[PDB]
Amino acid sequence: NAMQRRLERFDAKLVQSGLDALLVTGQNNIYYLTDFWGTNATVFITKNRRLFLTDSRYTLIAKQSVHGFDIIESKDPLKDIVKFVEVDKLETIGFDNQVSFAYYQALQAIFEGYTLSPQTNFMEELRM
C-alpha cells in the first residue's frame, strides 16, 4: 500500500506530461518503483499497465519480490514492449534524456512510427 502512491504519483505525472507511456531503465529507478534491485530489468508503465521485463534467470526472484507489475519473461525487452504499444494503440512514449544518443537511435528504429518524447528528471520527483 505504501509504494502504491509512488505508482499513483507516476500515473498522475503521465497525465500531466502528455505521455501514454514511460520507458524506465536504470536499476535505481527500477528499484524505486518495484523494490527489485538488479541490473537486468526494464520497466514500461502506461495509464493502464505496469510491465516488468526480465530474463529466465530473474523471473522467479522478480515474480515473488515485485508487486503491482505484470512480469514478462523476455530476452528482448524493447521488442516485447512494441507489441503492447501496438495492441494498446499508444502514441507518445516517454524516455529518460540521460540515455545515450546511441541508445536513442535503437529506440528510433524499434519504435519507428511512434512519437518518442524525451523527459527531464521525470523519476526525480517520484524518487523524492
UniProtKB/TrEMBL annotation:
Residues 6-128 form the Creatinase N-terminal domain. It comes from the Bacteria. Belongs to the peptidase M24B family. This is Aminopeptidase P XAA-pro aminopeptidase. It comes from Streptococcus thermophilus (strain ATCC BAA-250 / LMG 18311). The gene is pepP. The chain holds residues 1 to 126 of 353 of the full protein.
